[model samples]
Target: GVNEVPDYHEDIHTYLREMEVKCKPKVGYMKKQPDITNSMRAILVDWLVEVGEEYKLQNETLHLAVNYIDRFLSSMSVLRGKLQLVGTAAMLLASKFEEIYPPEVAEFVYITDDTYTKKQVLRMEHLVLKVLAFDLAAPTINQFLTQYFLHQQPANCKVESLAMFLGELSLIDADPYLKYLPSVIAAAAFHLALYTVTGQSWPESLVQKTGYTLETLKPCLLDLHQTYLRAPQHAQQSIREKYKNSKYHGVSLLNPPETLN
Candidate 1:
């Protein structure tokens, strides 16, 4: 159980955890889809980042889009031809559901270079809704990151921004990261970001608050660190390029620590 803070609602945290376990994509869902390679998924995620930014969508909307994309894939076997369609519809649903004023279906179609007809996107949206059973409120790493950062109140914008950068970077990959819970990813992002920002190790007191010991966070933390190290040369450059902006304080350009101890 997560230790409760004085000003926070434990029930909200409990409910969030429950939703996290309940709504996450099945582990190894990619294996179920024979046509889909990890790189293929990564490309869609990268494009989704562009779509999100193009429409001025919130980070939560982007996270929701990816969640739906992954969850829909978990149960359905989509051909590579239809992967963009799936990704588009996921973003449509996420935008409509998460954004106050989401983009029009035509706009989503336009973003696809009109490769997909409006009718096609609408049809896919229906299919996505049915497959996901309208479970659009799945907890996201972005949300968890906010909760953790709010709880700790580190008062360091760079730590928060860099954590977000790392979390979004993980979205481009589909293997081991998909297997880890969003909370773990958030915690690991915070740990790595904090260490990178301050050179301070994740302490026991902080671990107690996050409900993940340093040991539990190690594997994902290391994976993210590897991603950070490799981001400069990675083919999926949208996330890295986006973070390099001054708005994010250019955290993506900052070097990740070589080791996470």
Candidate 2:
């Protein structure tokens, strides 16, 4: 079912790699902030997962919104009181960018229970845009995972769902995972997913397309595997509940491997 009309697919992949490098957030930016910590960021992301589900926003919208948050927080430090404002504005901006029928600004304010006003959200939107230097089209883990599937032409739907679940889990926990690139995480997710599903590791096509060898992906693979192992009992259960739906074939219920191949 691969589409053949995109003759310049190589160019697209190359450009995505370039943007990944250009738009990556500072891995340790949280240390520079005096008012915020990674746990606060994790809490916001967990809430955003709920918001994304409630609004029926595209999966990409949530990922893009998180990307905006990390990039914005990397450079600017805001008080604890205004953190939700930053998250709300990032989601608003991402909705417009990624959704065909984006939610109204009023709806976003309502989600905050009027804790943030329309004017406040709009102003934060402008500030987020400015702070990120308008670099809104950053590559995401979902994008790379999709590209991997298209090129590798995997036949199992379970693999895709489990991979995506792992990706969302990584988005919530930024401790060691944020240090890895979107592509690396995507590749690692696939590597783990395929291994868990089929008892196989990286294929040649995946290696070539992702520009990663099993050796290069080992650390991330372990990290993603750890994320998967913790998903069932993790504090953030939204993502786990999401993939548990029949729509995802209940991939979340599947057991992760005890040890990677």
Candidate 3:
């Protein structure tokens, strides 16, 4: 039935199996060192998060946009000043790729105070697409969340909200590779949310369903907890405040796991 929740059942396995062989960004796809700091990448992702929300875009578009940026940077070298250009151009492409009613190009141009001419963005769009080799059809980590929500019919809607909250935290995460694929991040976030709402850790069914041992999950889980532990110190709190809204069930307000200990 369309209403049946997939849970960790066969349907979940299907999603996992299909996504396993998909094309993911290479290990060092993003820049580091003197060229750009992780902080700068994080801030760009944060601003894109705000812009996506402001335009009422889907989470698919937002995550996909970030994915595009990471992959584009992997093969191409970009200057610091044009980082925002790269970020927004990726968003424009993602919006068209995933959105039902995508925003207009002029809207994005206007969003930039016209500093970036339409021609500038238009050219970059072609460049980003070319750099990515036009491989825009892969199923992203956000697709896993979509599968969970659309098919799972979760008992507590908070699970969806909490899972998504933590999933978004992955964009600014420490490392995108080294076993930290988007699927793993999404699964771990959902697992933590399950424990948060249910007070129980991953059971055999969930362990098998998520295909992640507690061991593989621990590092990222611990790191994400630290992200919340120090979020108050961040110069920008858009993500925290964004999730704090009523629609999100104030998920951003929940205490970090370590604090409860």
Candidate 4:
């Protein structure tokens, strides 16, 4: 028997492989699009992080909501004014799917200060669902990390602490999260994380598992490093603060991966 493979990881992998068709959304959903700059998209994602925290939502919910937003935006053009509506409705649907007892639809509307009516929220909800083909099948960098962790179990909190900081830094950008597939970022984050902690990047297992060679992964690693390096220049800091706590092992306090060299 294959040793130490958890049942849940297998389930997730199976589901992700099946959902691979949906992966195109992240890459093509926002290109040469009008009325929405990457900066605007970045701000919306930052606000979503804050909203997710306020609602005590899980990371999965936050990421899933972002997926819905990108996927929906991929197919449609939304005005800047309605960006918040898209974010909230996406979160509302995401919470329901990921949260055990998601806040009432009204609670989501309430958080919007009733800026969006129940009718409008429901409409956007239906619209987002319809645009996304009603699929919640996006794979994420987190899945790649989990698949690796299921194998390595991390050497200590440092591995997780460092890795989480690096991965979230990737999410802060449209480039790293969009330019490459989830597995590439996952493999690169782990590659960079291990090198940061131990100063020696070895063990080809993660590379093998991700089906990406270190050479092929080099560009993604560089992109991730560049994002981490420029993070201090980002307009938002909520995700940075969230990682600065004990629950996250305060990995945000760690040096940027760019400094590892």
Per lDDT, the best of the predicted structures is: 2
State in Å the error of residue 78, model 3. Answer: 0.2
Candidate 4 least-lDDT 10 residues: 1-10
Model 1 residue runs over 4 Å out of place are: 1-8, 203-205
Index of the highest-TM-score prediction? 2
Q: Summarize candidate 2's per-residue lDDT along 136-234 as a digit string, tens digits.
A: 988999988887876545578888888888888999887887899999999998888888888877789877766799999989988888888888777
lDDT of model 1 at position 64: 92
Decoy 1 TM-score against native: 0.94
User: Model 3, residue 174: displacement in angstroms?
Assistant: 4.5
Candidate 1 per-residue lDDT, tens place, 1-261, comes to 345455565566778889999888888888788998889999999999998887889999999999999889988899999999999999999988989999888899998898889999999999999999988998899878876775454568899999999999889998769888999898889888888998766656656665788887888887888888988898989988888899999999887787765
Candidates 1 and 3 compared: the better one by lDDT is 1
Quote the lDDT for 59 in model 3: 81
Off by over 4 Å in 3: 3-22, 30-34, 148-154, 174-179, 259-261
Backbone clash total for model 2 is 0
Give a tens-digit lDDT track for model 4, residues 1-261. 355455555576666755654555657455657787777888888888888778888887887787788777777888888988999999999898888979898888888888779999999999988887777757767766766665554465677667666776666577547777666777778777777776756357755555577788888887877776766677878888888888888777777654544
Clashing pairs in 1: none
State residue 89's C-alpha deviation in candidate 4, in Å.
1.1
Q: Is candidate 2 or candidate 4 better by TM-score?
A: 2
Query: What is the lDDT for 176 in model 1?
Result: 67
